[PDB]
Design a protein around this ligand. Structure first.
Ligand SMILES: Nc1ncnc2c1ncn2[C@@H]1O[C@H](COP(=O)(O)OP(=O)(O)NP(=O)(O)O)[C@@H](O)[C@H]1O
Ligand SMILES: Nc1ncnc2c1ncn2[C@@H]1O[C@H](COP(=O)(O)OP(=O)(O)NP(=O)(O)O)[C@@H](O)[C@H]1O
Ligand SMILES: CCS(=O)(=O)Nc1cccc(CC(=O)N2CCN(c3ccc(Cl)nn3)CC2)c1
Ligand SMILES: CCS(=O)(=O)Nc1cccc(CC(=O)N2CCN(c3ccc(Cl)nn3)CC2)c1
Ligand SMILES: [Mg+2]
Ligand SMILES: [Mg+2]
Lengths: 352, 352
């Protein structure tokens, strides 16, 4: 049976596959032809169907897992296309997490003799994050931060060490946002959550700009000016609100300038895309800072796929968390953002 | 000179006017004709120009202020129409607060011999809130709450006593949101703020629904179904996420269902109006709960004009704060929501 780990989220399905590389000549013969077909199909292709993609750059090579050496692959496709994935399988023990592990449980059982073990989203995320950081990113650091995020000419990506990870605040930005407090390998809790996450950015941007992909929305946002839609502190005061340390550039009312008809007619759809990204990202950073202060944790790590190929939100989170906390909080990022739940699910395989 | 108090916000100008009713026959003669014209104009009309409105139902009658008896009037008009207000005046000591007191300072000085004293937004709000509650709403309670907000058949407006107000968390929902911690009459601080406030609701609703007024947006929202645009917990899990006490009706991703083109074509503009209101209101309630727990305050009072003639957001805030805090936090409301800054400004008159 192939070694899979699956995280079926509200938007994307994340799959981690361990490809054995220490296969003996005897094991090759005893290998069923289906096992050879799936290993070939997954390793000989980087695009599966019309919506499946293998993130080759994230592959962990020559990893010792469950006593065998192999390569850890990372694959994603939209949850909307899961019925196609299941239909291909109908023509194995599967450890699955995320909300879709429960919603689509009966659908997975349509595969004959398939064993489905539902694992919790929290346990898989924590165990997956701690594991990937422990085995490193092919010798490189899994965790990184943006040094000197306050100054753009110095803002550069730099590695960060998590050999003593606790305490840790995990901000999972998926369709929504989940915030976890990790005090030990077995002591972690979900602090809170907010429904304004990646789905809000993509949903609002589609309504406002007509964008047809997450990548197209980011490209629109890169060419836009969010101040054309947002009302700033200087729009209300004429300058900085120094009594409470609020600079003039700070946003006072997101989309606040859109109450005037003349500015709705002048705003570009690139501006609305940027304003949507800024609004969602700033609110997540503010909520993350509030939970960090209440939980008394100074390291805040951001995961989920809202931040993939999304450097603007990362830089925005890095600058915001450093400025507003006056340097006491650290925004941290991980190379394998959206796959930790799938890895944690795969790590539950020996328990069955 | 007339006794005015003005709060020039980013969206609305709030004006409090004390009309003397104990005027003697000698004072009437010594009264200049301009003083008689303005008192007549403000008391003989409920609509000033095309955008000014006097909230007659909020008037405080037979109030003893500064040693004289009189009526306290409450008037509002859009900040966009302030140049008209100033032009009418050009053809008096004015205590003004809000961001517009600084932005439009030079404009007020165009009125000959006018004395403009800028007062801070925080001091006027706290002093205005505590004053109106102390003198009551014509014998009735200024503060009220929604009892049994968990059960709709029992949810009813009930008075609330604030004779010992401290501690108190004030959530000022204007264009943005400001959150204040009030520990005493002279010990209060701005905890934090979020740019997702009333301006975000009105701005986004105008972009999505083409609404042309705050009242029209609320009427659209009353006829809509926010679940047509929001992705719920049951949309991701198929039911309740009982591991973390999340019911199936809870929103997992605001506007999250709008990532699918088929649902963007099926959603009504009434649904988008409701989803905008719910998204903004729920996020404010969640932020208010987080600040209340960190500040260790159990009474959260909501002010600003985002909640005027807006019972849905009030009921939403009342239900959310009671449910998610498991009954430990209380959502409180005040009859004179958006005028406390203007009252506090007027109360600074003896200091000049
Ligand atoms: N190719 C993509 N398609 C859709 N969304 C993408 C894509 N790439 C990045 N994203 C962003 O990543 C977010 C989803 O991230 P993800 O962590 O996978 O959430 P999820 O697990 O599927 N939902 P949830 O059940 O709440 O965890 C989307 O809302 C987008 O903002
Ligand atoms: N007639 C109205 N016109 C516009 N907005 C209204 C109106 N009535 C209620 N509102 C709502 O009330 C919000 C403004 O409330 P308000 O407390 O007066 O803010 P403000 O003080 O002018 N802005 P700020 O400078 O940030 O305090 C608007 O964003 C609307 O959501
Ligand atoms: C990965 C879990 S998921 O699959 O269910 N998706 C998901 C993603 C983000 C948020 C949520 C919902 C959530 O966490 N809530 C707790 C905090 N809330 C509030 C709201 C108002 C108030 Cl006054 N107080 N608290 C709103 C409800 C779900
Ligand atoms: C009445 C005062 S006003 O006139 O200036 N209007 C106004 C209304 C609401 C909010 C604001 C701005 C504000 O309070 N901020 C502090 C908290 N923020 C963040 C953002 C990200 C992070 Cl990581 N941490 N903190 C954002 C900035 C202004
Ligand atoms: Mg997820
Ligand atoms: Mg205001």
């Amino acid at each position: 049976s192939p070694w899979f780990g699956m995280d079926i989220g509200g938007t994307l399905v994340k799959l981690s596959y361990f490809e054995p590389i220490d296969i003996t000549a005897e094991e090759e013969q005893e290998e069923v032809e289906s096992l050879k077909s799936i290993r070939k199909y997954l390793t000989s292709n980087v695009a599966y169907g019309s919506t499946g993609i293998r993130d080759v750059h994230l592959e962990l090579k020559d990893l010792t897992l469950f006593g065998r050496r192999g390569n850890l692959h990372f694959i994603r496709f939209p949850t909307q296309d899961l019925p196609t994935f299941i239909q291909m399988g109908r023509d194995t023990v599967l450890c699955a997490t995320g909300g879709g592990a429960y919603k689509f449980e009966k659908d997975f059982r349509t595969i004959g003799n398939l064993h489905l073990h539902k694992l919790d989203e929290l346990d898989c995320l924590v165990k997956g994050l701690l594991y990937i950081d422990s085995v490193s990113f092919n010798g490189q650091a899994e965790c990184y931060y943006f040094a000197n995020a306050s100054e753009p000419e110095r803002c550069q990506k730099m590695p960060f060490n998590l050999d003593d990870p606790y305490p840790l605040l995990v901000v999972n930005i998926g369709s929504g946002v989940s915030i976890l407090a990790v005090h030990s390998k077995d002591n972690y809790k979900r602090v809170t959550g907010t429904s304004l996450g990646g789905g809000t950015f993509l949903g609002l941007c589609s309504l406002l700009t007509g964008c047809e992909s997450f990548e197209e929305a980011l490209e629109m946002a890169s060419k836009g000016d969010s101040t054309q839609a947002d009302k700033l502190v200087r729009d209300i005061y004429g300058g900085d609100y120094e009594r409470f340390g609020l600079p003039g550039w700070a946003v006072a009312s997101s989309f606040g300038n859109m109450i005037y008809k003349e500015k709705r007619e002048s705003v570009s759809k690139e501006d609305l895309a940027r304003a949507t990204l800024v609004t969602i990202t700033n609110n997540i950073g503010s909520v993350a800072r509030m939970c960090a202060v209440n939980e008394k944790i100074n390291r805040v790590v951001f995961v989920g796929n809202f931040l993939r190929v999304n450097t603007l939100s990362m830089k925005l989170l890095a600058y915001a968390l450093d400025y507003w906390s006056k340097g006491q909080l650290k925004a941290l990022f991980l190379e394998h953002e959206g796959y930790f739940g799938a890895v944690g699910a795969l790590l539950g395989l020996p328990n069955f």
